[PDB]
Amino acid sequence: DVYAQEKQDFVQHFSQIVRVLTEDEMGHPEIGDAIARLKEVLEYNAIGGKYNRGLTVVVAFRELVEPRKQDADSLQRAWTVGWCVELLQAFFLVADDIMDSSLTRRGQICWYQKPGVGLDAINDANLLEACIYRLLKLYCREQPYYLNLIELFLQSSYQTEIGQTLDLLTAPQGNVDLVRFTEKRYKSIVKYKTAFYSFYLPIAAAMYMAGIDGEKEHANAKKILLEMGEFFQIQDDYLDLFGDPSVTGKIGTDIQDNKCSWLVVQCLQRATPEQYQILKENYGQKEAEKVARVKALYEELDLPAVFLQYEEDSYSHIMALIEQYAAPLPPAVFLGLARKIYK
Amino acid sequence: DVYAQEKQDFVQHFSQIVRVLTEDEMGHPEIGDAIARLKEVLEYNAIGGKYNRGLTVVVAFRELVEPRKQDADSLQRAWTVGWCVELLQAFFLVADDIMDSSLTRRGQICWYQKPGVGLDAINDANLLEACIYRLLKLYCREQPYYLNLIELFLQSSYQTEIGQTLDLLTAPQGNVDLVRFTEKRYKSIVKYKTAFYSFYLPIAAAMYMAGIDGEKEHANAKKILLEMGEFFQIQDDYLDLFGDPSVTGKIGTDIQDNKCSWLVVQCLQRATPEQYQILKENYGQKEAEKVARVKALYEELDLPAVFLQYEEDSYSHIMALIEQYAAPLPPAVFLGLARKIYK
Numbered sequence: 001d002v003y004a005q006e007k008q009d010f011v012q013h014f015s016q017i018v019r020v021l022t023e024d025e026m027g028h029p030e031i032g033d034a035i036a037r038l039k040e041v042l043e044y045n046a047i048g049g050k051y052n053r054g055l056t057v058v059v060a061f062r063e064l065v066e067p068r069k070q071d072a073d074s075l076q077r078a079w080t081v082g083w084c085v086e087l088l089q090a091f092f093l094v095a096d097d098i099m100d101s102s103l104t105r106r107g108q109i110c111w112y113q114k115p116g117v118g119l120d121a122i123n124d125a126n127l128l129e130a131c132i133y134r135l136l137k138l139y140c141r142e143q144p145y146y147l148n149l150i151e152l153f154l155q156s157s158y159q160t161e162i163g164q165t166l167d168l169l170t171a172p173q174g175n176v177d178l179v180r181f182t183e184k185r186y187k188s189i190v191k192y193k194t195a196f197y198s199f200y201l202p203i204a205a206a207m208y209m210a211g212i213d214g215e216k217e218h219a220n221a222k223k224i225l226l227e228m229g230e231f232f233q234i235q236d237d238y239l240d241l242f243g244d245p246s247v248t249g250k251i252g253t254d255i256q257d258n259k260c261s262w263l264v265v266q267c268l269q270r271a272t273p274e275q276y277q278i279l280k281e282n283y284g285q286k287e288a289e290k291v292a293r294v295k296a297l298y299e300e301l302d303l304p305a306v307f308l309q310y311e312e313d314s315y316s317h318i319m320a321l322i323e324q325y326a327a328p329l330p331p332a333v334f335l336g337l338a339r340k341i342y343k
Numbered sequence: 344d345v346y347a348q349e350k351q352d353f354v355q356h357f358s359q360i361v362r363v364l365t366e367d368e369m370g371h372p373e374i375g376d377a378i379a380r381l382k383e384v385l386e387y388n389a390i391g392g393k394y395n396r397g398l399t400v401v402v403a404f405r406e407l408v409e410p411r412k413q414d415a416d417s418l419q420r421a422w423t424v425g426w427c428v429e430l431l432q433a434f435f436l437v438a439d440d441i442m443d444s445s446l447t448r449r450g451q452i453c454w455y456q457k458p459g460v461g462l463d464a465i466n467d468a469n470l471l472e473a474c475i476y477r478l479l480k481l482y483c484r485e486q487p488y489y490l491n492l493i494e495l496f497l498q499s500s501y502q503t504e505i506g507q508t509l510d511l512l513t514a515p516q517g518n519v520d521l522v523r524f525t526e527k528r529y530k531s532i533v534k535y536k537t538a539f540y541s542f543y544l545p546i547a548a549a550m551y552m553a554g555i556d557g558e559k560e561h562a563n564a565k566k567i568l569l570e571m572g573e574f575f576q577i578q579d580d581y582l583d584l585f586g587d588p589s590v591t592g593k594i595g596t597d598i599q600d601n602k603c604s605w606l607v608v609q610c611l612q613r614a615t616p617e618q619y620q621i622l623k624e625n626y627g628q629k630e631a632e633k634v635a636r637v638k639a640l641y642e643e644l645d646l647p648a649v650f651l652q653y654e655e656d657s658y659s660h661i662m663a664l665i666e667q668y669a670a671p672l673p674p675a676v677f678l679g680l681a682r683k684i685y686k
């Protein structure tokens with residue numbers, strides 16, 4: 001497929017990415033040990049996911065830039081920017097795993113949990129961030145959209161950080177206070193912490209590289225992409241519990257982590273004073289018994305049905321948004337992405 | 344004095360800095376709680392130091408830009424960039440205190456050690472970083488040196504991070520291995536982790552704002568400033584032990600922290616097989632008895648004398664560097680700074 005076939009050339013470019021970044025020890029053998037540590041940080045944290053966001057940069061690029069203007073250097077730059085996106089995500093994940101004390105990521109042990117790393121992962125996360133800008137300078141220094149990408153990456157980081165701050169305030173590390181789990185807060189968290197960098201960033205980057213720097217073009221694409229981002233995260237929350245581990249490829253624990261999941265938000269709106277106490281006394285527990293009890297209150301409230309209803313209405317809304325805001329961009333850009341997200 | 348008088352206008356501008364940054368909740372009440380947290384992060388971590396680096400931006404600006412080209416808006420921008428420097432430092436300090444598990448900073452409790460903060464300080468540190476770029480956009484978006492400052496701040500961050508990585512590798516959190524405490528490693532650490540952002544960054548920023556964007560002008564200033572940075576840190580290490588708490592305003596613990604101090608590096612070069620074992624069995628201990636023992640081996644090796652000798656030779660070298668590389672810049676720019684560092 002569009003991704004399956006392109007995913008190969010994208011992942012293989014990583015070797016060049018790492019080479020070019022670890023090429024600073026060239027005229028500076030003094031920082032050699034630091035550069036080696038950097039290479040270990042990159043190879044462990046940037047590899048191992050699905051690379052969809054980075055891949056979305058490359059895919060969108062081919063659909064926005066004319067075939068002739070797609071020389072070897074242009075595609076080289078597109079692969080790099082796509083990788084910068086993955087780097088931005090690695091930066092967040094490494095730091096987020098530390099903040100929430102996670103044990104594993106992608107079935108693999110969290111970088112900071114590795115023997116000899118620990119809190120040093122904080123500096124490792126900052127380096128992943130810095131490599132984003134080192135790569136842009138190395139490959140797009142002479143491009144007319146150089147400053148655009150820099151500002152875009154910086155803005156995405158800030159949004160994500162703001163969203164993470166909001167998330168940390170909403171679901172503390174010891175406050176099951178369901179009072180703040182509102183739908184307005186949930187949407188705000190998803191928008192800033194996930195939607196902006198996951199859906200807008202990748203497409204916006206391809207846009208700038210294609211010369212589409214118009215503020216209106218970006219605002220129109222933003223309206224569409226932020227909406228897909230919200231649906232993506234809502235579906236992700238639903239699947240985290242009612243999903244099938246065989247298909248998804250992972251087990252959910254949002255309930256055990258007192259997460260401000262879409263499910264809990266729905267349950268809070270659809271619960272009587274008695275039901276509230278049931279959730280207010282089961283949300284955030286390692287007891288498989290207390291968790292299964294929660295999943296029970298959800299089914300009883302037919303949340304899965306609500307989700308199904310929301311999904312259909314969501315697919316309709318997004319299709320309407322695409323028809324209205326896609327132009328002048330090729331609708332395929334958004335349609336191809338929506339097809340991968342919606343079931 | 345030049346600083347003492349200007350320090351007032353600089354510190355007072357902070358209120359405007361915070362106002363302008365916390366003005367994002369304006370058209371977005373949704374992220375209000377996040378913006379309030381941000382304001383607490385800023386007011387606690389950016390205030391409380393001496394502000395010399397930020398101040399050095401303002402001072403250098405007045406000496407590089409003609410009096411007429413110093414309108415109210417130009418000085419406004421200079422104060423902001425100076426504050427961005429302080430923000431970059433706050434970002435490093437907050438993150439460094441967490442990484443080395445410090446208890447206090449500036450006599451005050453480390454932000455992350457505050458009740459309710461903890462590892463969330465990681466996200467707080469990333470925000471301080473982001474505010475640097477938000478301020479540059481807000482005040483220098485239309486300036487011709489905009490991209491210059493962005494690249495400068497990004498480069499300084501990367502250097503500092505690289506230097507921190509090197510430092511973490513050199514003096515682990517449980518490896519008193521004095522084998523890596525060489526002078527070449529010491530100089531590398533100081534250059535990347537301290538000199539670049541502390542001495543080059545501030546002056547380089549004033550340079551770009553003054554239109555001095557020449558690569559040669561910056562390379563010449565870099566040679567001078569990196570040298571002052573090295574001396575600054577060496578003197579700082581010496582004072583950390585042999586200094587007077589009344590004058591310095593703090594007690595040293597580099598020996599107790601197994602720091603790769605200039606002193607220990609000197610001691611390793613000036614120690615016989617028997618003396619080495621003495622240090623190899625006392626460096627990095629909380630026992631005031633074992634620490635005083637170390638200070639003893641230093642005095643015996645007349646390190647203070649060595650430092651004194653190094654200081655004089657250092658002042659001569661730096662003066663030679665200024666006479667050779669200052670032009671076309673006003674020598675005062677470097678002389679004023681050197682006068683503040685050298686005793």
Ligand SMILES: O=C(O)Cc1csc2ccc3ccccc3c12
Pocket residue numbers: 050051052053056198199337340341
């Ligand atoms: O990354 C995933 O695992 C979801 C996913 C599956 S396929 C796919 C295609 C494009 C994306 C863009 C942004 C975020 C996600 C995705 C995604």
Ligand SMILES: O=C(O)Cc1csc2ccc3ccccc3c12
Pocket residue numbers: 393394395396399541542680683684
């Ligand atoms: O910041 C300090 O405490 C040392 C100091 C004393 S006065 C002063 C003036 C300019 C500086 C520039 C960079 C770093 C330090 C300083 C510094």
